[PDB]
Amino acid sequence: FSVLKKLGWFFKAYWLRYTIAIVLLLAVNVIEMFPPKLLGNAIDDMKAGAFTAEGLLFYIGIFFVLTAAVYIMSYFWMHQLFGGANLMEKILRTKLMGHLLTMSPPFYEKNRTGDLMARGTNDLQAVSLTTGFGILTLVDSTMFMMTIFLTMGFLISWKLTFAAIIPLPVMAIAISLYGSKIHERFTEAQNAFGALNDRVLESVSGVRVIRAYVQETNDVRRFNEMTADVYQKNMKVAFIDSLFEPTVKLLVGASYLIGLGYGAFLVFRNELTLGELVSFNVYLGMMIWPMFAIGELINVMQRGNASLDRVNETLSYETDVTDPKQPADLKEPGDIVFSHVSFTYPSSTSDNLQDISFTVRKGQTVGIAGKTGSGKTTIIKQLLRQYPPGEGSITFSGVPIQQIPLDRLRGWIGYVPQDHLLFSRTVKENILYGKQDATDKEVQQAIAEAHFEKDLHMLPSGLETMVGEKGVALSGGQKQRISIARALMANPEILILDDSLSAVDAKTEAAIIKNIRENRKGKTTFILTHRLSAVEHADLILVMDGGVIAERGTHQELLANNGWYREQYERQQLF
Amino acid sequence: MKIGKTLWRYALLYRKLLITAVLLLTVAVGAELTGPFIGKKMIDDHILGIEKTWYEAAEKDKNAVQFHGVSYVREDRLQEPVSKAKEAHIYQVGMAFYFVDQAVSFDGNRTVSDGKLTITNGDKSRAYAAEKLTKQELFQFYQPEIKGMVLLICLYGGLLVFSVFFQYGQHYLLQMSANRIIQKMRQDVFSHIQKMPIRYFDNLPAGKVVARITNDTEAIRDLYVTVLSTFVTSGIYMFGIFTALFLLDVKLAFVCLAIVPIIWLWSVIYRRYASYYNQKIRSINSDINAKMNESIQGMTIIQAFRHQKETMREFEELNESHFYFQNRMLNLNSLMSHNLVNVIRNLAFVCLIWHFGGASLNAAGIVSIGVLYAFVDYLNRLFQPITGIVNQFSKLELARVSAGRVFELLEEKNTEEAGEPAKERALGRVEFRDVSFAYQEGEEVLKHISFTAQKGETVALVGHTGSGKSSILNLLFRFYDAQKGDVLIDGKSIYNMSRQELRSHMGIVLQDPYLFSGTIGSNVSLDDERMTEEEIKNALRQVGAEPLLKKLPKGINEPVIEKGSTLSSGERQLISFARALAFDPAILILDEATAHIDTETEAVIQKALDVVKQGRTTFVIAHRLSTIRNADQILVLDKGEIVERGNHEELMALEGQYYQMYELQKGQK
Ligand SMILES: CCCCCCCC/C=C\CCCCCCCC(=O)O[C@@H](COC(=O)CCCCCCCCCCCCCCC)COP(=O)([O-])OCC[N+](C)(C)C
Ligand SMILES: CCCCCCCC/C=C\CCCCCCCC(=O)O[C@@H](COC(=O)CCCCCCCCCCCCCCC)COP(=O)([O-])OCC[N+](C)(C)C
Ligand SMILES: CCOc1ccc(-c2nc3ccc(-c4nc5ccc(N6CCN(C)CC6)cc5[nH]4)cc3[nH]2)cc1
Ligand SMILES: Nc1ncnc2c1ncn2[C@@H]1O[C@H](COP(=O)(O)OP(=O)(O)OP(=O)(O)O)[C@@H](O)[C@H]1O
Ligand SMILES: [Mg+2]
Ligand SMILES: [Mg+2]
């Protein structure tokens, strides 16, 4: 099977468990075959009055021992087989999460966050049944079928056994075709689960927008359409799933008629003994169950093949940014010099950065300004290594950025995103992301360097205030100051303030800027702002116009160069 | 019982499909059960039927077979004389048939004839005679049986072929009904979630609500397909077995009925445990989803601050708990499964042996052994159905737990009613009267808010971070109800109007823009109202987004990824601003709209606003005092209280917080 060939990696790791399970299963088969013969012997001995007192105390004891043995060994092999299915879920979930944690935005642009969740909570459930109930049914039905085939071939006859088997190949081909189609149908249906998850997420993450504009009616209708689409793709699987039972029943009933007819003909020609045919009919009656078992098996295996295929598709996404195999032993970054950097985003077609070249010397504070959609944050992202490296080069003290392990580089850089990102924890927990093993005094210092003590006094529980999901239980400026404290906690070599003063009033903005000027003295800083009062201290100011540095220099020359910088300066201060 | 009495209602809704499925299932089960009995009839009447008495009759009996010049007739194919001549039995010792033409016999005991068939049953073994029938005479004897089989096998073939459709129809209808019920459940849950207040969403992870809709509804399907099918099939099988048992015995089928209580008791013992674990499992599942959504949406920060190890450790705890509780269900599914029913079967055999073993001392049962073969066969057939249903308890309990988790959400008492959009455009008279608000009990975030906005004016809200301006916006939109005071649109209080009408009176630009999936035009238009492309383009040009369009190939048709990840924050803000301006709202509310937008585009936006702000009330919450420099009245908030108000000249003429903030914003030069 494709699913088993794909799970061979796990089956090899866990071989003793399944070996024990199979051995116990075969043993249980035999130890269950015995009770029928024992009871038959007991009843036969009860006929002529030969059943004595010893017979009772022997039959009762042997039946009790048989019951206890079957119970214990069955418990054990069901523990081993099914117990190995849960390990499927655990291992696959761990692998999936560990893969997601090392994935860059380019991966997340293509893969929706609703689809991924369905790939770790539902696909695993589909795949789990393959190694548990799937393996049990396979081996159990195979042993039962082989026992029926062998007993009919040695006890009764061979011609009859080869007679009531002709239907079986046709059943095999039919079930194989149905499984092949059900694989595609179930792959299509499973994706409709990710779409439903995404639809539910969007209607929840953006509830405020929907309710403010009164789009509830147009939101319920879209969800109803999505549910109808999901239902349609489920029926396309039902139309094939329902064919597994009728086919098996028909092609076993044909076997029954063939066997009975051939047996009657052989009896008429005097090849049978008239007691062989009754036993043969009894044996034929048993054949039905393994066929239903194999049909259910083929149905289940394909249900897990599609989900495993999706999980493997997720897990086979090579990293966009690769940690160097032979890194550089650089300890601290001295000079960040861009040289003819040309970078275009994956989904774009126009060069977002075009021939960028500037130098940031150790300790210098660099400001980047420009109209909306110019490329300011693209440089910061070039430093952060979120997307595959573009052209040109970015050398950290003469060593290209590529030949530096991501852990060290990330430790160097303290990032403040332009879009606030917070988790559902206490304020202190969020602030400690920069330095988990940090004393309360360090947190207090970081807070006081972001002009946030007054808010802490104002807040209900102070540092122990649970911020709602995404921080919805805080003001925008409070989120910004929490992010600034997070960045400043680690005391990063390079501090990236990407529009970190946007919802911070004017007094709070002045205070934070003064603190930064007195905190990053002699350290590297990238300040991105639309207000030009936060870049007055910068040694190098870069004006970005459509992916190209239109102007450069400090405040004085940019003022003396007229153009965009002087225009904005005059419109922002002389007002 | 909410869980039991509710799943019935959903089944009752689609009662036509389910009733048809049950009828098809019953017919298919009846046909399948009958089949083997047709086979048994064929056997016992056509291939084993050359064993009963062959009365010695003459010709002209409508059926007769020549044998050594004398034609005999079978017992049943014979007409109705009484004891015509004698009984000429047939017996098949070894593998060949031997004719008994001498006289009658008794209960047979096969023994080699050697010309004299010895029937050693008791003592009467006369060794009558024997004559091998060769092969041609046997075929002559069997020809009418050939006719019978050929006319009876086709009956089995017909019953088989005409019963193929019923199985497919039953299964397809069951699955269709299950899918329809899941669809209805999801739609109802989504409607209710649309009917819940914002407090519910603010302190609940988005992954815990998606789980209750999608994850917790997939697990209820099995309750209607596999469980129902298996229960119906087993019920029919056991009814057949029991009615069969009662006919051939009494006081021995009554004891067999003791199986019915035991299973019930078994279920009661299983449920009590399978419940507790299942709940936990389900709960943990939700958490995992949350952890998969919280982490994915914030992966950039997790990687930037090297929090991967802790996040994986945080995730691994939930995975380990889920795995542990699944293992705890392994023990229950192992103790109460096929095993226990096989334990009872052996116990039943032991009880039968002990009871009849104590009766075989006097050989009582052997004389009455006519009720032993049938009883043992029926007892063995009894446990095949039972093993079918006991395996359905796990699915039943999982479905019950999932249904309960869905219904506890569907039955939430807290809920806000709904109305219809506004019928008449509002003049634009917005008034706050003595409004006091507190997000958390005992903590007033706004204290005695009082002001009035007239049509054609521009009320600007200013203050330090955390003052409570966005709280004023929340109260105006009735996301959060006030606690003391009133809010009036025109002269009507906003609490006597439907929320949909109030929110239709105004269009807002939220502090943090949100972009839905689809094209930019979709976000600007939200797929409602009159989405004329020219109007959308006009709004985009008004907001100053024109460059963004000429930097994109398809313009307003450019696809927008989830959350607009491929758009700069300023571009997202411009798109949201255009969305707000495209509805031509009576009251326009801006909540720090120009926060990530440069000064050039900000000036363009202000120019666009001024042109059509002579007949539209506007609320501006801005930390950039330049945009509200020329406003009808500015209000300064401090700790949730309005301390200063008036025109800009009035505010500057009295110094104060606004004066200080404006001077700081103004060039220190
Ligand atoms: C007749 C046939 C049965 C004969 C039984 C003989 C006695 C045996 C008794 C006891 C021996 C116990 C040995 C302990 C070993 C523990 C460690 C271990 O290997 O565990 C393994 C499980 O292994 C088991 O748990 C085996 C269970 C055997 C059950 C036997 C039932 C017999 C009942 C008889 C009833 C008679 C009633 C009589 C009348 C009252 C761990 O699994 P694994 O595969 O390692 O998984 C991880 C793999 N990895 C490490 C690579 C990651
Ligand atoms: C429901 C009435 C009461 C309620 C009324 C009020 C509600 C009315 C609402 C909705 C009702 C919708 C119809 C459902 C009712 C069943 C009939 C039917 O047409 O449905 C389907 C099932 O039908 C069957 O299964 C019937 C038996 C024939 C089966 C033929 C294929 C398998 C044959 C055995 C081969 C075995 C192998 C043999 C060996 C190789 C018909 O099939 P389909 O493909 O789903 O139909 C296509 C249409 N579709 C594209 C839109 C999906
Ligand atoms: C001579 C004319 O009379 C005959 C009398 C009896 C038999 C006969 N031969 C048999 C051989 C196998 C079985 C059988 N009994 C079993 C019980 C349980 C299991 N399983 C499957 C389910 N899992 C959970 C446990 C193991 C398979 C089993 N296989 C019974 C049998 N009955 C044949 C002809
Ligand atoms: N992931 C992305 N894929 C493709 N294009 C992108 C992506 N992110 C941004 N862009 C586009 O690239 C251009 C530059 O965006 P960038 O975010 O670098 O601008 P910015 O100067 O930081 O903007 P703002 O002032 O709004 O913060 C814009 O057209 C933006 O839409
Ligand atoms: Mg930016
Ligand atoms: Mg706010």
Curated annotation (Swiss-Prot), chain A:
<keyword id="KW-1003">Cell membrane</keyword>
<feature type="domain" description="ABC transporter">
    <location>
        <begin position="336"/>
        <end position="571"/>
    </location>
</feature>
<dbReference type="InterPro" id="IPR003593">
    <property type="entry name" value="AAA+_ATPase"/>
</dbReference>
<feature type="domain" description="ABC transmembrane type-1">
    <location>
        <begin position="18"/>
        <end position="303"/>
    </location>
</feature>
<dbReference type="InterPro" id="IPR017871">
    <property type="entry name" value="ABC_transporter-like_CS"/>
</dbReference>
<feature type="transmembrane region" description="Helical">
    <location>
        <begin position="148"/>
        <end position="168"/>
    </location>
</feature>
<dbReference type="GO" id="GO:0046677">
    <property type="term" value="P:response to antibiotic"/>
</dbReference>
<dbReference type="GO" id="GO:0016887">
    <property type="term" value="F:ATP hydrolysis activity"/>
</dbReference>
<dbReference type="InterPro" id="IPR011527">
    <property type="entry name" value="ABC1_TM_dom"/>
</dbReference>
<dbReference type="InterPro" id="IPR027417">
    <property type="entry name" value="P-loop_NTPase"/>
</dbReference>
<keyword id="KW-0472">Membrane</keyword>
<dbReference type="GO" id="GO:0005886">
    <property type="term" value="C:plasma membrane"/>
</dbReference>
<keyword id="KW-0812">Transmembrane</keyword>
<dbReference type="InterPro" id="IPR003439">
    <property type="entry name" value="ABC_transporter-like_ATP-bd"/>
</dbReference>
<feature type="transmembrane region" description="Helical">
    <location>
        <begin position="20"/>
        <end position="40"/>
    </location>
</feature>
<dbReference type="InterPro" id="IPR039421">
    <property type="entry name" value="Type_1_exporter"/>
</dbReference>
<feature type="binding site">
    <location>
        <begin position="370"/>
        <end position="377"/>
    </location>
    <ligand>
        <name>ATP</name>
    </ligand>
</feature>
<dbReference type="GO" id="GO:0140359">
    <property type="term" value="F:ABC-type transporter activity"/>
</dbReference>
<dbReference type="GO" id="GO:0055085">
    <property type="term" value="P:transmembrane transport"/>
</dbReference>
<dbReference type="Pfam" id="PF00005">
    <property type="entry name" value="ABC_tran"/>
</dbReference>
<comment type="subunit">
    <text>Heterodimer composed of YheH and YheI.</text>
</comment>
<dbReference type="GO" id="GO:0005524">
    <property type="term" value="F:ATP binding"/>
</dbReference>
UniProtKB/Swiss-Prot annotation, chain B:
<dbReference type="GO" id="GO:0046677">
    <property type="term" value="P:response to antibiotic"/>
</dbReference>
<keyword id="KW-0472">Membrane</keyword>
<dbReference type="InterPro" id="IPR027417">
    <property type="entry name" value="P-loop_NTPase"/>
</dbReference>
<keyword id="KW-0046">Antibiotic resistance</keyword>
<keyword id="KW-0813">Transport</keyword>
<dbReference type="InterPro" id="IPR036640">
    <property type="entry name" value="ABC1_TM_sf"/>
</dbReference>
<feature type="transmembrane region" description="Helical">
    <location>
        <begin position="245"/>
        <end position="265"/>
    </location>
</feature>
<dbReference type="GO" id="GO:0005886">
    <property type="term" value="C:plasma membrane"/>
</dbReference>
<feature type="transmembrane region" description="Helical">
    <location>
        <begin position="347"/>
        <end position="367"/>
    </location>
</feature>
<keyword id="KW-0067">ATP-binding</keyword>
<keyword id="KW-1133">Transmembrane helix</keyword>
<feature type="transmembrane region" description="Helical">
    <location>
        <begin position="223"/>
        <end position="243"/>
    </location>
</feature>
<comment type="similarity">
    <text>Belongs to the ABC transporter superfamily.</text>
</comment>
<protein>
    <recommendedName>
        <fullName>Probable multidrug resistance ABC transporter ATP-binding/permease protein YheH</fullName>
        <ecNumber>7.6.2.-</ecNumber>
    </recommendedName>
</protein>
<dbReference type="InterPro" id="IPR017871">
    <property type="entry name" value="ABC_transporter-like_CS"/>
</dbReference>
<dbReference type="Pfam" id="PF00005">
    <property type="entry name" value="ABC_tran"/>
</dbReference>
<dbReference type="GO" id="GO:0140359">
    <property type="term" value="F:ABC-type transporter activity"/>
</dbReference>
<keyword id="KW-1278">Translocase</keyword>
<keyword id="KW-1003">Cell membrane</keyword>
<dbReference type="GO" id="GO:0005524">
    <property type="term" value="F:ATP binding"/>
</dbReference>
<dbReference type="InterPro" id="IPR011527">
    <property type="entry name" value="ABC1_TM_dom"/>
</dbReference>
<comment type="function">
    <text>Involved in the transport of four structurally unrelated drugs, including doxorubicin and mitoxantrone. Transmembrane domains (TMD) form a pore in the membrane and the ATP-binding domain (NBD) is responsible for energy generation.</text>
</comment>
